[PDB]
Symmetry: C2
Subunit: 348 residues, 2 copies
């Protein structure tokens, strides 16, 4: 069957958090306005996409665009595939603002709510917007990729949305985004350092600068979970385990270009192979968070909390060993065409 | 370095909670009268269709022709065009605006409901508008992308409160009005884009306008339906929006230099005849006729005051914001950071 995007294969579960716990967040408003909002960079001090692109109001514009394209010839298709996937993930931004606005105690109820929570969501969104913009124009000018197939993938992606399975729970929500932000920090950070190798400093600065925005986001979301562990170590420990069993699905897992039915798997494979984001990175993030939130040092947990706590502390090495042995899928990986690069083929 | 803020008290969940069912019921209906107005992905235009092709040997000359044409387009017009583009780029805010509506919100981010499906596909459609105008302005060299990017970040941080109070009634009235506004602005920049000598730019604006009409058509069929099922609540919602006035999605525009950026942008749009105080009236009047407000009967003493107010507001607005004496002729010249502080006539 033709033009059918992939769908979420799990049953939709809404409003799992007990409705009384909504007050905890109303209470933490002030706290958020002092421990969280402080991780937003004020607009006037933020970089903008133009800072890293050829200046179209400068006599230098032509040579700049020309050097950009020359450099891009020395960057192999493999890398463009990954980079394209990252950029597409970024452009599906409106979905992610919705992701935060689904959380019970934290949603923006009007579109301009004076709450600390709604203020964060809006400013976080505003920061994220520059990531897509910048990688978009870069890919556009490069000439190495097929902007029409990329634009088409993006429209499929927004139509599809995503269900991270947070069930409207600020607990699950902020656990989720804590994990994703770090993942984003690793991918972008990796494309950055790798971007230097292939011979493009400017592209490295681009990726690096996006990475730095991610760290700050991670820091912000991790202070919230930390705080939730402090206030409710039982609910939070339980929320943490729940997310992991479910597995953290990536925001663009429903990726579809109208040709490949396994586009996300394929994109990911290349990212894995290239060492941009690996099955191992997923583990390191998990382990980091376990240590960062002091899950192990938690005491006075219900028989429920204890099973959860133990599960979470012993999942990283289990995931490690298992999705370690890249025997039958790393070496014998077939070559595959991607419509994002005009059906040129790269090694999966 | 303070962005403007909504000056009105925040009013949430005004629609009676029982009326949430009306929408759950209309799911199938929506999947046959609304979703039909979305263009399937494979058949949609994409920004690359109207831009220089960067994987073509023709790229250079195409970028070069684009820039040459843009020199013949005056600063006035770039101001308006930039404002339009900025409004488009604040898209995530508008998805949120629809996700705030009580009986229609997407509860997960991927809800199989007709309502959530529409919201997501409408958003996907809108996204190409921003992308296209963005790359156009970027290649043009006529405008200061850094100041524009900064305005955009202020705008999303600010969001907007259209004062729909989570009511699908108010919501879809609102978006019915906006879509038509959008169709007029884009439509006008389109025809005017021809004058100044740029066909391609006209095709860009025109293609955006067409998207808008379809959206308008879709939102209008919902209100029509609401008038049919609940002529009282709908008539009352329609009047409520108008007293409050329909505020534009980008009214909290801020670039870090101008404290009246939206007013100023609008002034230029007005003067240029892209979107005028008169257009606002014509949209209103059209909707009054399109929804058959006047032909409504059996309304409460409440419904009737409302019905009358709405049918007599267009000419009142007309005459009033007609006489552009003290503000059209003696309009001062003002610098915009979007064009490197070059100045245009307000
Ligand atoms: Fe990002
Ligand atoms: Fe981020
Ligand atoms: Fe639009
Ligand atoms: Fe529209």
């Amino acid at each position: 069957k033709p033009f059918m995007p992939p769908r979420e294969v799990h049953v939709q579960v809404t409003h799992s958090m007990p409705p009384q716990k909504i007050e905890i967040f109303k209470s933490l408003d002030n706290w958020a306005e002092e421990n969280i909002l402080v991780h937003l960079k004020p607009v006037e001090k933020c970089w903008q996409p133009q800072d890293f692109l050829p200046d179209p109001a400068s006599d230098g514009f032509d040579e700049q665009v020309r050097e950009l394209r020359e450099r891009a010839k020395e960057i192999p298709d493999d890398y463009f595939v990954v980079l394209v996937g990252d950029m597409i993930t970024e452009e599906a931004l409106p979905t992610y603002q919705t992701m935060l606005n689904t959380l019970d105690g934290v949603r923006d109820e009007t579109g301009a709510s004076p709450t600390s929570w709604a203020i964060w969501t809006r400013a976080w969104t505003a920061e994220e917007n520059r990531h897509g913009d910048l990688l978009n124009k870069y890919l556009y000018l490069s000439g190495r990729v097929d902007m029409r197939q990329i634009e088409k993938t993006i429209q499929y992606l927004i139509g599809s949305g995503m269900d991270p399975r947070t069930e409207n729970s600020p607990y699950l929500g902020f656990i989720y985004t804590s994990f994703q932000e770090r993942a984003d920090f690793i991918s972008h950070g990796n494309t950055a350092r790798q971007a230097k190798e292939h011979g493009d400093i400017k592209l490295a600065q681009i990726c690096g600068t996006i990475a730095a925005d991610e760290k700050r986001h991670e820091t912000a979301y991790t202070k919230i979970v930390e705080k939730l562990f402090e206030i409710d170590p039982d609910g939070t420990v339980l929320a943490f385990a729940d997310m992991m069993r479910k597995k953290i699905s990536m925001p663009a897992h429903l990726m579809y270009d109208g040709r490949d039915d396994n586009l996300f798997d394929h994109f990911s494979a290349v990212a894995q192979r290239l060492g941009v984001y690996t099955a191992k990175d997923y583990a390191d993030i998990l382990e980091f968070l376990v240590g960062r939130w002091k899950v192990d040092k938690l005491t006075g947990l219900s028989a429920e909390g204890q099973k959860a706590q133990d599960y979470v502390c012993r999942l990283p090495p289990r995931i490690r060993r298992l999705e370690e042995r890249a025997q039958g899928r790393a070496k014998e990986a077939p070559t595959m065409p991607f419509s994002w690069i005009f059906d040129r083929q790269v090694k999966l």
